Amino acid sequence: DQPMEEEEVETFAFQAEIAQLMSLIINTFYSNKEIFLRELISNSSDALDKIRYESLTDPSKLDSGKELHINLIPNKQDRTLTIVDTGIGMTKADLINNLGTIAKSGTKAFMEALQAGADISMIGQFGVGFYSAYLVAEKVTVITKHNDDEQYAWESSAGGSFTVRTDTGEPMGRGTKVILHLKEDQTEYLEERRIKEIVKKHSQFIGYPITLFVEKELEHHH
Ligand SMILES: CC(F)(F)CNC(=O)N1Cc2nc(N)nc(-c3c(Cl)cc(Cl)cc3OCCn3cccn3)c2C1
């Protein structure tokens, strides 16, 4: 009797300061949590800038898809909010290096700044805005696809470690999906009016199309 699927899953420990930051963010009360969406859309914009720049000199970099955009996908049934871009994406090494194992100077800098009276909303200025996702999410899953490379899934519920594995689900052309599994009391960010007002207020100057796709599994077909 053979398995439908088998795949290797790697578990990595977060660098100590990153673990520290994630604990502070996911546990502490803050009154301006909506800033997470600005930070993720900002990361997507940056990733789109990168692939765009590459395509300036090598058009073939867009063979995996010419459209440069950001999609926002609330799914009330799964209690997930997903931010999708067709930006540059990440290799497996990028995931492991950039999402937890290597310490950035801005990680301790940001926590120092907060203790010195700075606001959480400055997190992006320290290059660690992604982790603001844990203001509203109990678990974050990142699915990513870089040119020439396989599609990978990174995941963490915090608590000191993350996992990486190959993603065999629906193949992306190129880019990154950040899937926020929301905290029970944070479901307001699945509502259309809330998403719209947050994008309007905080992401006004993003130079790529941002599109809402409200997702619902139709009855008996979940
Ligand atoms: C060489 C490379 F092009 F740079 C590899 N490409 C990446 O490293 N990324 C592509 C990407 N796309 C989205 N939508 N988000 C993230 C992102 C995530 Cl998921 C987690 C953290 Cl901690 C930081 C992040 O971006 C920080 C800011 N940045 C955006 C692009 C690059 N740096 C990344 C990282």
UniProtKB/Swiss-Prot annotation:
Family: Belongs to the heat shock protein 90 family.
Any one GO molecular function term: ubiquitin protein ligase binding
Main location: nucleus
Entry protein name: Heat shock protein HSP 90-alpha
Residues with N6-acetyllysine modification: 50, 76
Subunit structure: Homodimer. Identified in NR3C1/GCR steroid receptor-chaperone complexes formed at least by NR3C1, HSP90AA1 and a variety of proteins containing TPR repeats such as FKBP4, FKBP5, PPID, PPP5C or STIP1. Forms a complex containing HSP90AA1, TSC1 and TSC2; TSC1 is required to recruit TCS2 to the complex. The closed form interacts (via the middle domain and TPR repeat-binding motif) with co-chaperone TSC1 (via C-terminus). Interacts with TOM34. Interacts with TERT; the interaction, together with PTGES3, is required for correct assembly and stabilization of the TERT holoenzyme complex. (Microbial infection) Interacts with herpes simplex virus 1 protein US11; this interaction inhibits TBK1-induced interferon production.
Primary role: Molecular chaperone that promotes the maturation, structural maintenance and proper regulation of specific target proteins involved for instance in cell cycle control and signal transduction. Undergoes a functional cycle that is linked to its ATPase activity which is essential for its chaperone activity. This cycle probably induces conformational changes in the client proteins, thereby causing their activation. Interacts dynamically with various co-chaperones that modulate its substrate recognition, ATPase cycle and chaperone function.
Record has Glycoprotein as a keyword: no
PTM: ISGylated. S-nitrosylated; negatively regulates the ATPase activity and the activation of eNOS by HSP90AA1.
Gene Ontology cellular component terms for the protein in this record: apical plasma membrane; axonal growth cone; basolateral plasma membrane; brush border membrane; cell surface; cytoplasm; cytosol; dendritic growth cone
Localization per record: Nucleus; Cytoplasm; Melanosome; Cell membrane
Natural source organism: Homo sapiens
GO annotation (BP), single: cellular response to virus
Keywords: Acetylation, ATP-binding, Cell membrane, Chaperone, Cytoplasm, Host-virus interaction, Hydrolase, Membrane, Mitochondrion, Nucleotide-binding, Nucleus, Phosphoprotein, S-nitrosylation, Stress response, Ubl conjugation
